[PDB]
Design a protein around this ligand. Structure first.
Ligand SMILES: [K+]
Ligand SMILES: [Mg+2]
Ligand SMILES: [Mg+2]
Ligand SMILES: [Mg+2]
Ligand SMILES: [Mg+2]
Ligand SMILES: [Mg+2]
Ligand SMILES: [Mg+2]
Ligand SMILES: [Mg+2]
Ligand SMILES: [Mg+2]
Ligand SMILES: [Mg+2]
Ligand SMILES: [Mg+2]
Ligand SMILES: [Mg+2]
Ligand SMILES: [Mg+2]
Ligand SMILES: [Mg+2]
Ligand SMILES: [Mg+2]
Ligand SMILES: [Mg+2]
Ligand SMILES: [Mg+2]
Ligand SMILES: [Mg+2]
Ligand SMILES: [Mg+2]
Ligand SMILES: [Mg+2]
Ligand SMILES: [Mg+2]
Ligand SMILES: [Mg+2]
Lengths: 132, 325, 117, 208, 80
RNA sequence: AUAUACCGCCAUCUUCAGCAAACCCUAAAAAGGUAUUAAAGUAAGCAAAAGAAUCAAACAUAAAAACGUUAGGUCAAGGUGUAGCCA
RNA sequence: UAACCCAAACUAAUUAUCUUCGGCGUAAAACGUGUCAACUAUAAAUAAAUAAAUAGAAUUAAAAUCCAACUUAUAUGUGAAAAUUCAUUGUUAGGACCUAAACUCAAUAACGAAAGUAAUUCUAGUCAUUUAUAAUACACGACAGCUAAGACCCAAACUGGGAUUAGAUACCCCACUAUGCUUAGCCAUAAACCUAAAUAAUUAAUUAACAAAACUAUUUGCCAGAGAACUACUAGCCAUAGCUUAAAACUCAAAGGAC
């Protein structure tokens, strides 16, 4: 049996998001890609360096916004600009988000030497695609 | 111990609001695309959403959509009883009020025809509606046994003398079979600078592709890639494959063909030319002959192509030796 | 006439010793048993022997037994069609009688009841 | 298969399509009208309306082919037919007028009648009686009877020949010696019949 | 009151479980014990069933008509 | 050190047709619950199906394949419970 | 460590206090069968004439066996073989024998207390006590077995030979005896079970399961966890490796019935 990235069935009480519900074979069919860069296109270089930055950028955002992430973040690279689009729960006060945005942007712009912007869409609570 | 989200049944006020938001959506989408709201249509909407939200997901159900609420929201079956609680339909307690209400009518029709007392093929090339289509008409779910019984009752109605009312009735449950035109698409007949008539058609066998240019008048001179056919095809079986189209129609030595085949091997290239010549020669033969070609295999593309190899297997079907135990 | 079943079983009514000792209760079931398969008989066995008989005399040379060889084909050719025609038609028709499946469904439309309703 | 089960095998008989409509039996006439609404498999690369195409020889060629080498197998068959035609012309020219009449110089007619002679009519088969297998004489079917004649020919020539002889020279000499019913392949047919004779006792075990 | 296998209709027992009264036509082979208002009579003949169907239809229509008239008379008195 | 504490990622049955939740019925129920000319079963979820992929079409091939079975495989991909070494 | 119970007591060992109106188709239990007493109950005055009860005598159709005539070269036997046999084998409208057993009828259900009993014929013969209820008495009691004398077609423990198997003191093959039969006597045992005592009712006021529906009264018999135990000891007996009668020590926390 295949165990890869499959949220298995319980007794109908496990909420799962759209991203979690779909197994790997639905990638490019029902669900898209969380990161969009040009490094895996044919005749393009620096796939390894873009992929390592993604791993870190995801671990950074989880720790910097602990318990405030409704879904996995979406990374969008255009030219040298990096754009982070994160669904965040409305747990923290509003002013705290302004602090963490200023901090996380400046810190990641001086770490990778690129302009990095954070885009936050706040949800009242996690969106449930289906109960499995 | 059931704790899952219940069906979010859509009330009429809900769908009514979903139609006001959609109507305001169209006016905004029109203003974005610079079009006139009055004439903006469903077709323009689908094109606009595809431009503004490019998605390359293979399944099109998973792509962005701004459709009318009627298309997306399933028709809610209306309440079957009123405020006092009395069901609206006398067959409510059967559990299949619409299936049995229809079977009640057809059984009553049969009785009047049998009591009251020509060719029955008033409609031809038609089929009985499939179970899925019937379910939609009744707005309920049926079993296979329910479908089988409904058809038998409808057949009995046709057997009996039928007035025009019955013919219209049974018509509702007969779907016009869109029998496809399994006939050749004859090519046009162009004219060269010399003024001679000629037709062209493509052919594909395995990975080979050919583009023949048959001429209406000729002495049987076939040139493949600017070479003769005896030179290009040193094997007899490959030449016989080029002979099959003309020999069949007794048209040997009456046409001049110019071929251009690229790709594949010797046998795959002869086969591709055979199909290309058969399809080009259609314009210079009678329709009865074209059917004679189609029914002899000359006009069908061969779908047999090399099958991908499988991981964990020696070949497409060949397996690794099951090791001795 | 069905044999008598009065004073056979061992019961408090019966004064004498029992006659019948059924393995199972004597109550008609609502089904019939699945009829055990029946096979046919060899066809053209006589014609095969005739062909083989001629070979033995003529050192298994088909030149001598040309006529007999053609009779063997003739019988086989007839039987070949007969088995084809009879399986396609007679078996499908089931006109003469009901099968175990068809019989049981009729026996269930008017089932035997050994219990009060 | 890449052909859906609704596809029909092609009919590549030139005369059939050009026959007058009245000459066709209504059963044949019915199929033509039905086929107008059906799908037709493409003809094979070896399927042609040629007047020189013989299915029996085309099948015999495929049974000699090794590893998809159709050119070599077809070449060997062409050399065989030629080797038989050249062997009969020599005999015909070197024969009296009376003898010349009997001599057959058609290689296609020597090939067909040679194979038919080798065909075995009855061969032993394993049949199950009482959960046990017995070797009972059985009537061989048409396809199995034809296959056995060709297989026995291609196997005598392939194996039981000198090292320096070639297949067109062993096959020609075997088709000709089976056109007169005096060859090794005929002896193999006489063994299959001889063995069935010994086991005739178990003939009635057959249930068809 | 019997199904097509000559057994009591399932709704006879299930209607008693729900405490629903039952008016049933019972013949000499049926079980009237659970029928609230048994009507002994022939259930097979078309003339018997047609008579019973007519009686239940005329009875029900009369009762519904009487209710309309009773409501009109009493309602009219309220203004009058 | 322990895969006989596990995660992770798989094998096998298997391209097998089931699985589990909420109910309902039984002269009591350990359990069982189908008959279509229908006799106590019902209506949702997962799997199958459908759909998508191999860039017309079909077919085919891939992929997919629930709950379980084998304390199946892997502490040596990485991580980790408990125990152990720390000149 | 804390809690809980009892408390000038508390725990352990020992002993004692609680005792039949229940059961007997399958869980323990209806005696192999019948008859005669005294009680305890019961209340009617019938029965019998029955197709295979029982005993005796006579009888015989089929199939065997023996002798004889003629006669294949083999006969016999198995899943396959071997062994065995040619003093055989097949036929006999030929002779003798009268050993043993009773096809069809029997899809019948009779008789008898039970055991048991069905080839034919004849003789003898079952029968009335209101009913239930009996041993320490009397009379019976399949099959096997014992004693003496006979019978002997066939079958057949044992035994010998052949085969199978790792072995085969077996299952299969061949030969043959005790024995099955008769005449007396003995033995007294069976899953002697229709696992249901007999008699008179009743069929509603009534499903532990399964089996062959439930259930009342009467009288006797029997049962009281399993194993030890169809045993030990005792007494009776034609029984002597026997039958009936029938414990305890000791062991266990279950055994058992139905599903
Ligand atoms: K018994
Ligand atoms: Mg290969
Ligand atoms: Mg039994
Ligand atoms: Mg009735
Ligand atoms: Mg494991
Ligand atoms: Mg697999
Ligand atoms: Mg597709
Ligand atoms: Mg699928
Ligand atoms: Mg393990
Ligand atoms: Mg291991
Ligand atoms: Mg007992
Ligand atoms: Mg003799
Ligand atoms: Mg005699
Ligand atoms: Mg007398
Ligand atoms: Mg021995
Ligand atoms: Mg003796
Ligand atoms: Mg004796
Ligand atoms: Mg005893
Ligand atoms: Mg007895
Ligand atoms: Mg004893
Ligand atoms: Mg004793
Ligand atoms: Mg003693």
């Amino acid at each position: 049996k295949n165990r890869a990235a499959r949220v298995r069935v319980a007794k109908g009480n496990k909420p799962v998001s759209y991203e979690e519900a779909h197994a790997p074979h639905y990638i490019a069919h029902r669900k898209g890609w969380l990161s969009l860069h040009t490094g895996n296109l044919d005749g393009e270089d620096h796939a390894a360096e873009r992929t390592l930055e993604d791993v870190f950028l995801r671990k950074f955002m989880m720790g910097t916004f602990p318990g405030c992430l409704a879904d996995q973040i979406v990374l969008k690279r255009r030219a040298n600009q990096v754009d982070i689009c994160a669904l965040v729960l409305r747990q923290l006060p509003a002013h705290k988000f302004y602090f963490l945005v200023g901090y996380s942007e400046t810190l990641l712009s001086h770490f990778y030497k690129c302009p990095v912007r954070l885009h936050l869409q706040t949800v009242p609570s996690k969106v449930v695609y289906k109960y499995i | 111990n059931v704790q899952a989200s219940r069906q979010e049944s859509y009330t009429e006020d809900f769908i009514k609001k979903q139609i006001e938001e959609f109507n305001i959506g169209k006016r905004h989408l029109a203003n974005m695309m610079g079009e006139d709201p009055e004439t903006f249509a469903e077709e323009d909407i689908d094109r606009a959403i595809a431009y503004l939200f490019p998605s390359g997901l293979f399944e099109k159900r998973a792509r962005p959509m701004m459709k009318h609420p009627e298309h997306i929201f399933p028709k809610q079956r209306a309440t079957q009883w009123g405020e006092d609680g009395r069901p609206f339909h006398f067959l409510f307690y059967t559990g299949k009020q619409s299936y049995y209400s229809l079977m009640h009518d057809v059984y009553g029709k049969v009785m009047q025809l049998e009591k009251h007392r020509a060719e029955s093929r008033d409609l031809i090339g038609s089929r009985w509606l499939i179970k899925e289509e019937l379910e939609e008409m009744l707005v309920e779910k049926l079993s296979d046994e329910d479908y089988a019984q409904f058809i038998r009752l409808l057949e009995k109605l046709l057997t009996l003398p039928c007035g025009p009312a019955e013919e219209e009735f049974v018509q509702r449950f007969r779907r016009s079979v869109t029998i496809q035109s399994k006939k050749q698409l004859i090519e046009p007949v162009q004219y060269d600078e010399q003024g001679m008539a000629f037709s062209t058609s493509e052919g594909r066998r395995k990975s080979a592709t050919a583009q023949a240019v048959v001429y209406e008048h000729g002495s049987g001179k076939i040139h493949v890639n600017g070479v003769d056919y005896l030179i290009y095809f040193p094997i007899t079986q490959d030449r016989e494959q080029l002979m099959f189209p003309f020999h069949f129609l007794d048209r040997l030595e009456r046409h001049d063909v110019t071929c251009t085949v690229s790709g594949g091997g010797r046998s795959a290239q002869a086969g591709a030319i055979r199909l290309a010549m058969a399809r080009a020669l259609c314009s210079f033969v009678t329709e009865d002959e074209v059917e004679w070609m189609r029914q002899a295999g000359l006009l069908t593309p061969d779908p047999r192509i090399r099958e991908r190899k499988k991981p964990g297997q020696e070949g497409a079907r060949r397996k690794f030796t099951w090791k001795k135990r | 006439a069905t044999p008598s079943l009065r004073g056979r079983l061992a019961r408090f009514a019966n004064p004498g010793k029992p006659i019948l000792k059924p393995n199972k209760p004597l109550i008609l079931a609502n089904r019939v048993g699945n009829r055990r398969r029946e096979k046919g008989e060899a066809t053209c066995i006589t014609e095969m022997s005739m062909m083989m008989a001629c070979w033995k005399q003529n050192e298994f040379r088909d030149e001598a037994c040309r006529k007999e060889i053609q009779d063997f084909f003739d019988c086989s050719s007839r039987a070949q069609e007969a088995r084809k025609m009879r399986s396609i038609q007679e078996s499908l028709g089931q006109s003469e009688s009901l099968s175990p499946h068809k019989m049981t469904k009729l026996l269930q439309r008017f089932p035997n009841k050994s219990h009060l309703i | 298969s890449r052909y859906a089960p609704e596809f029909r095998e092609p009919l590549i008989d030139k005369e059939y399509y050009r026959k007058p409509v009245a000459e066709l039996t209504e059963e044949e006439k019915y199929d033509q009208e039905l086929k107008k609404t059906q799908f037709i498999k493409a003809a094979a690369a070896t399927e042609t309306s040629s007047v020189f195409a013989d299915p029996v020889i085309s099948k015999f060629t495929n049974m000699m082919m090794k590893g998809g080498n159709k050119v070599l197998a077809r070449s060997l068959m062409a050399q065989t037919l030629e080797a038989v035609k050249r062997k009969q012309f020599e005999k015909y020219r070197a024969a009296s007028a009376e003898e010349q009449a009997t001599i057959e110089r058609n290689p296609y007619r020597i090939f067909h009648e040679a194979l038919k002679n080798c065909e075995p009519v009855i061969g032993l088969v394993p049949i199950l009686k009482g959960g046990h297998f017995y070797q009972v004489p059985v009537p061989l079917a048409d396809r199995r009877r034809r296959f056995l004649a060709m297989k026995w020919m291609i196997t005598e020539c392939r194996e039981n020949k000198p090292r320096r002889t070639l297949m067109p020279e062993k096959l020609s000499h075997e088709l000709l010696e089976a056109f007169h019913n005096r060859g090794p392949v005929i002896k193999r047919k006489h063994n299959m019949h001889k063995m069935a004779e010994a086991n005739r006792a178990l003939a009635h075990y057959r249930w068809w | 009151t019997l199904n097509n296998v000559f057994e009591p209709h399932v709704a006879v027992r299930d209607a008693a479980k729900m405490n629903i009264p039952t008016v049933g036509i019972v013949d000499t082979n049926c079980n009237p014990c659970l029928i609230t208002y048994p009507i002994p009579g022939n259930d097979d003949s078309p003339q018997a069933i047609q008579l019973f169907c007519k009686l239940f239809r005329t009875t029900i229509n009369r009762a519904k008509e009487k209710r309309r008239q009773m409501e009109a008379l009493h309602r009219l008195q309220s203004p009058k």
